[model samples]
Target chain A: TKVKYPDGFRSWYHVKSMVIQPGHPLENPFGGIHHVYANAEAIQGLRGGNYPDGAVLVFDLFDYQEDNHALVEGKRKLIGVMERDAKRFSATGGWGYEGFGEGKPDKRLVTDGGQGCFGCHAAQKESQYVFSRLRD
Target chain B: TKVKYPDGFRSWYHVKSMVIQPGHPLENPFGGIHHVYANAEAIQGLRGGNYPDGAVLVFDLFDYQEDNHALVEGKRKLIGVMERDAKRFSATGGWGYEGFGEGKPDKRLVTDGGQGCFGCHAAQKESQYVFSRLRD
Candidate 1:
């Protein structure tokens, strides 16, 4: 299924990890906390093989700030989603990429398809266009 | 003993964290990762609710990079070390702040000692000039 909404993703999956990018990193179009989240199909894929259809990866990006005595995350900036639909994303290795701002779908700065997303994931082609090695 | 050099910090104690803007929030004159390394004395300090003079804390800074398909780190960035010395740093609440860069000691744009280092940590007066909070 196409990932149109992310209602309970924060609770749907465990937070695999986080990567902070201050400037526009090539693999990413916007700069924020790349909160990587993976669902059931995705977790299974990380076991030892590639992800199957229905697998969804979301990067809920958030702007950062200095709070109290530390620098911290502030507001949500963009919600980047990548899902495996086999047929829906077969054009780009069975993965569809998108970015959402203000909770609504929007065109990504890295083009619509995988030119911007898969190009970077290609480095981890063995892991099937996905970074952030699985958690044990 | 230079806090025993905080050996093995680059290994297991890895959790890519938030950022710190050297100059300020809007325009950062200097910036890098604020890696935290705590010695036994320092851990005790956290448990006791106050860092003792013998306690030591180190912050390793690094330049970040996200290359084609890989998230790479670059440069020596800088290393910020703070040794808790009651009499030595009494003016700054017992924490001596010094920084190193490019594999050696470089001038820190954040100033030095009291005005340079303690000023920032001072915000966390309760934490005793320590800003980092371990992940739960």
Candidate 2:
């Protein structure tokens, strides 16, 4: 299944942001600053279970550098996305996952049909395989 | 009076975000998506009263464009900042305010010594002249 790039997702609700500095356990692959965004449909899903179709969530990751004691976003690393399509992606818990290298729409990063991503997301099944919650 | 550019304020706690669109009263100058962030000292202030020295808050504004029914951040508009210094800024409720045009550190946009900014913030006197609160 193909998950189209979520164009203009930055205009959606900005869920939150985190800076994964060195020494953090997630520093290996997620070593950077990442911001999460949710589209209108995804915002509804964040309220409770049973996300409707067209719901999409974005994970915008960026490399970071320390400058003058302030952390700065260096370069984009990836644009990880999750799109809900119960009928089309039922095998993966009704979600289609994909990653765009460096936030480029043309560069697709997911190769294993999203199984690896789904494996971790499955742990969040109670929340429809979503790990993030809306802040306030 | 100078409010130093908050170097890595984006890594701070994201207080909240709001999108001011066309037809809105704030459309002229504030028409866009704006995200608020607060530093450690400010977090304590959000609890209630007496913001300690060094408490900093940032209001990041961005121009937005609609694409495919999704809103995307277009260009950086301004990086508004508020720095707490009780004695240095006693006239403005213990806070120094400044705005960096297009997020550039060199471009200072405040001219009235923050009195204009303070006028609006004065309404938030109950929160130590701060309008944003940390989100869970």
Candidate 3:
């Protein structure tokens, strides 16, 4: 199984073009779409391990009330994006952030060491894609 | 770093029950809730060859269409499901019934010298799911 984006990473987004589906039945349930973007530099970083790479990034562009809020919204979006990135690289083993302000690791979203997270991620060793491989 | 499902598997699905989102301007515009599911059986099957003694099943659902469709669509889905079963206790590796008028290995999907399929499967040495684990 060839790992797609062996040298690249993926980025996911919501509310891309602002065309709501009118009662889409989701949390925001209005009009939103998710997009995945891949970059060569990100992939290189992932393989080298100098910086975080080979992960998935998810972004939320809308609020639960369908309001366009920033502040925490942006922070949440960044967190979501990082979460996606962690999953992409099969970083289920664990996450590390040894910064001055950062103390202890947040295991809430750590997939590598978790039962549900690690098993599924490991399964993707063949296709390189953790979810499953796209058939050619 | 918390390996909760050390011997289980987890999966994520859209919460909105829609595979594709509508009315969003993006290459693959789709907005839906996600779900995650996991079970001890799936975990053991991937991590250790020792089957669990009636393990517990856990499902954590989420909505992330981009990852799901990209990973588990078409042939990839078929192979992915089979891989899980093959790694199970009773079943491992490729299964071809020769007595059923089928002689010789079917090269149809057996590309990359079986490594393409088995290589990824082999990673679950710690789990009891790998095909070789069943033999022991």
* Most DockQ-accurate candidate: 1
Best by lDDT: 2
Interface RMSD score of each model: 8.3, 17.2, 14.6
Identify the runs in model 1 with alpha carbons over 4 angstroms from their true place.
Answer: A1-3, A67-69, A105-111, B1-136
Candidate 2 C-alpha error for residue A112, in Å? 0.8
TM-score of the first chain alone, every candidate: 0.79, 0.95, 0.28
- Rank the candidate models, highest TM-score first: 2, 1, 3
Q: Over 4 Å off in model 3, which ranges?
A: A1-108, A132-136, B1-136
For candidate 1, lDDT tens digit of each residue in A35-75? Answer: 56677788778677668887788777666665532456666
Give per-residue CA lDDT, model 2, range B1-136, as digits (tens). Answer: 6899998675566666555667765666667767788888987887675689999988888786654333456777998899999999998989999999988899999989999999999998877887666533
Winning candidate number (TM-score): 2
Q: How does each model score on TM-score?
A: 0.47, 0.55, 0.22
Q: Which of the CAPRI classes, incorrect, acceptable, medium or high, describes model 2?
A: incorrect
Clashing pairs in 2: A11-B71
Model 3: per-residue lDDT, tens digit, A36-70? Answer: 22233333333443234444322222222222211
Question: Candidates' lDDT values, in order?
Answer: 0.60, 0.80, 0.27
Worst 10 residues of 1 chain B by lDDT: B7-16
In the range A1-136, model 2's lDDT, one tens digit per residue, is 7998999775566776555657666676877767798887897898775688999999988786644333445668888999999999898999999999988989999999999899999999988999887643
Residue-level lDDT of model 1, residues B2-117, one tens digit each, is 22233433322322355544555522424544445566677677555667667767666656555543333456566667778878778777777766554353344335444656
